[PDB]
Amino acid sequence: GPKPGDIFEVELAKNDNSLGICVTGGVNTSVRHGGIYVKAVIPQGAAESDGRIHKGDRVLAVNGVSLEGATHKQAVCTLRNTGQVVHLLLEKGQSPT
C-alpha cells in the first residue's frame, strides 16, 4: 500500500450524491500536517465500506483543488460540490509528524 507520507489518489463514490463525512484541521491549525484530517468516517458508508479512507488519514486535494489551507468547513463544502464520484488525494496521516 501507500507508505507513510505517500500521496495516493482514490476514487470514491459519494453514494446517492450525498456524503456526510467529517473532518478537522485545514487552516494549518493544531493538526500535525495542518491538513484536513479525517475526523470521523461514518460506518456503512462508501468511505468505510470501500476502505479507501480511515480515520487519521488526511485529505490533500479534493477534485484537484489544493485543499490545504482551506478550512474544515470549506473542506466538506468542497467534498459536497463534487460530481458522482469524488476524486481526492489522500496522504497517509499515520505518519507521526
Interface ranges with ligand 33B (CB under 6 A):
22, 39-40, 72-74, 76-77, 80-81
Question: In whole angstroms, how close is the CB of 31 to ligand 33B at the nearest point?
Answer: 13
Q: Which is nearer to ligand 33B, 39 or 54 (CB)?
A: 39
- Toward ligand 33B, which CB reaches closer, 33 or 80? 80
Shortest distance in whole angstroms from residue 34 CB to ligand 33B:
16
Q: Using an 8 Å Cβ cutoff, are 10 and 90 in contact? A: yes
